[PDB]
């Protein structure tokens, strides 16, 4: 696995992140983690399994929010 965050993890942030990322293995596998720091995330977490990615970071949340706001104002 590979977990990406804006800052290094706190040790409780790590266990909450481990519990939220072990939901995404479709088996009884004991997947490991690899933390990396990219500053262009504004908080949140990206899980890079190299087979399935979940972009819950707020960079994509604010981008998706801006795209949704723009998709409503051209209709209203």
């Amino acid at each position: 696995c590979t977990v990406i965050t804006a800052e290094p993890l706190d040790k409780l942030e790590r266990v909450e992140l481990t519990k939220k990322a072990e939901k995404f293995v479709d088996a009884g596998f004991k997947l490991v983690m690899q933390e990396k720091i990219d500053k262009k995330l504004l908080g949140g977490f990206v899980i890079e399994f190299s087979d399935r990615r979940v972009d819950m970071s707020t960079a994509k949340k604010v981008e998706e929010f801006n795209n949704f706001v723009n998709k409503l104002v051209l209709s209203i």
Binding site: D10, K11, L12, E13, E16
Partner: protein, 441 residues
């Protein structure tokens, strides 16, 4: 031999022509002030239209025109601010009495002209003994309400306030100016309090001096309180409520004084509830909770709602550095009561955001069972400008009006909060500030 509607029709047909000069519109405005014709507005509008319409201006016509616009109390920001062209261009050609009148009248309407205030403040500080102290109080009123935080004129004013006795009008205007500036300079306030000895010739000067020492939060003098309770018929609702707000903030327990001031405004508010801005209704609710002066029953709950509207209004228009301050102080609060990892901090700060009983939204409100503590942030606008760097009276008012709602408010100023380098330090600072005022938590 005295007939006012004929002379009003005269002044209406006076400036209804095409080519009114400066002297005709200036003396028309002065003549409208000297008859007290606030009842009629369209003739005033003709006067202001021709005042903004003329182009020539010598010194005395503009001085009389802005004096009349001030004393008559017309507010029309476009035509008043368009007088600043000749007010700038004639500035050494104005006498010091003319200069004080013009800078005071442009300051009173809030004309944002930094060139005029710089080139008036340099004329003050470069020739100070040329000016009477009332002239300096007028220029200080003008440069203070004109949105200039000038300290050189304030110290040169405080010198003349320290040397020579001034009229209570002059001291009242200057205290109102320093309360707009937010200096709380004690070494000048103690001098300017010594002009309230013979009793003031007006009620507006005593009322604005009381609001001045409320917004600076010094002390009631018991002379201005006596001159206010003995002259409270000569105050507008926006003036009398501001006087009661300054009286409660200066810690007055004279209930006949607050009763005589609310006897002005409770029939006024019961006449038209919607005439006054909600800032003054919140100030009335502050004066009615701090001194405990009771109001009629349809007034008390209504201004209790109005204070909640005003608090949420100042919250929604938070100046975005204060919102950073509320975020940082609430983080320090959530750390000091125990949350070491950052999602714990985020959940606690997101749960510290309860509502007050009057509908308003409290930023940092903790409940340990039955008692409630409030953490308050005093960012920069509610501070003073002097090196003690203390809060003003509005946040002490907020602490007193929330402490009547079952809360124990701990004030965290930002002059002291921003010295600490680490979050454990700010956590200990906010925990010491809470544990001083509500130590049971």
């Amino acid at each position: 031999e005295n007939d006012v509607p004929a002379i009003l029709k005269e002044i209406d047909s006076l400036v209804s022509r095409e080519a009114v000069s400066a002297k005709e519109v200036s003396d028309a405005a002065v003549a409208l002030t000297y008859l007290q014709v606030k009842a009629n507005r369209r003739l005033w509008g003709k006067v202001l239209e021709k005042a903004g319409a003329a182009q020539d201006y010598d010194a005395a016509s503009l001085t009389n025109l802005l004096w009349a616009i001030n004393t008559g109390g017309v507010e029309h920001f476009k035509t008043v601010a368009e007088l600043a062209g000749p007010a700038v261009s004639l500035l050494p050609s104005l006498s010091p009495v003319q200069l004080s009148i013009v800078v005071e009248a442009l300051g009173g309407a809030g004309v944002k002209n930094y060139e005029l205030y710089n080139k008036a403040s340099a004329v003050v500080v470069s020739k100070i003994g040329e000016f009477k102290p009332a002239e300096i109080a007028r220029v200080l009123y003008g440069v203070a309400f004109g949105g200039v935080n000038d300290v050189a004129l304030a110290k040169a004013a405080g010198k003349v306030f320290a040397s020579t006795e001034v009229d209570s009008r002059t001291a009242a205007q200057a205290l109102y100016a320093l309360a707009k500036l937010g200096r709380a300079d004690k070494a000048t306030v103690d001098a300017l309090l010594k002009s309230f000895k013979k009793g003031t010739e007006s009620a507006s000067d005593a009322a604005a001096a009381s609001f001045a020492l409320g917004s600076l939060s010094f002390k009631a003098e018991k002379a201005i309180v006596d001159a206010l309770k003995a002259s409270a018929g000569d105050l507008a609702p926006a003036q009398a409520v501001e006087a009661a707000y300054g009286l409660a903030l200066s810690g007055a327990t004279d209930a006949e004084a607050f009763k005589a001031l609310f006897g002005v405004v409770a029939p006024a508010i019961e006449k038209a509830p919607d005439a006054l801005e909600v800032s003054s209704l919140a100030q009335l609710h502050v004066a009615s909770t701090i001194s405990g002066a009771k109001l009629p029953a349809a007034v008390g709950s209504f201004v209790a709602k109005a204070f909640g509207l005003a608090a949420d209004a100042a919250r929604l228009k938070r100046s975005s550095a204060e919102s950073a301050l509320v975020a940082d102080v609430a983080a320090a609060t959530a750390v000091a009561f125990g949350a070491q990892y950052r999602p714990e901090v985020a959940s606690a700060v997101a749960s510290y955001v309860k509502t007050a009983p009057d509908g308003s939204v409290l930023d940092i409100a903790i409940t340990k069972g039955d008692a409630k503590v409030l953490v308050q942030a005093v960012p920069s606008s509610l501070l003073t400008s002097t090196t003690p760097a203390k809060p003003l009276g509005h946040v002490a008012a907020y602490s007193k009006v929330r402490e009547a709602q079952g809360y124990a408010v701990a004030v965290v100023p930002a002059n002291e909060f921003e010295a600490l380098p680490d979050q454990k330090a700010k956590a200990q600072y906010v925990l010491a500030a809470i544990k001083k005022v509500a130590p049971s938590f």
